[PDB]
Design a protein around this ligand. Sequence first.
Ligand code: WVG
Length: 167
Amino acid sequence: VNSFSGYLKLTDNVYIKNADIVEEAKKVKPTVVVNAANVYLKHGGGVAGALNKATNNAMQVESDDYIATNGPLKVGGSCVLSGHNLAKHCLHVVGPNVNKGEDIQLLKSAYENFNQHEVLLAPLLSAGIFGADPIHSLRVCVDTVRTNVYLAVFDKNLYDKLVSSFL
Ligand SMILES: O=C(O)CC[C@H]1CCCN(c2ncnc3[nH]ccc23)C1
């Protein structure tokens, strides 16, 4: 038993809700919140900009030190950093950005990072400003993640289309 509430169950291990991931993180304090990161951990907009704003820019300060030490992530890769006031940990995961021409096949590699964590609150990778089809992203998630994932979908209209079209 865990503290996630109001989710629709899609499969044995994947759940979904119309929610603002920032507000969900603020209430649940999950062990892991996933950020929709880029390779530079520049949290300017989308999910990343919203998560970072909610930390009063502490996420960005920590991220800049991480990059200065380690260099950029790989597309499809991830790193574990602090969850600040939102979660114990933040798993920064880089899905391919279609608006940069990155290979959508890397989306599966991106979701594989979730399997290193027993339970996660997450957005749909490569959705939103990353330019991928969220229905495809959900399919890859279901077919790749084996750990327990709670997906927060900000847009109510999108949430209804994902549910109604789910196979
Ligand atoms: O319609 C969706 O979910 C997909 C849109 C992407 C794009 C970036 C922001 N998107 C979010 N997803 C969940 N929570 C959020 N809070 C603030 C933004 C946010 C995900």
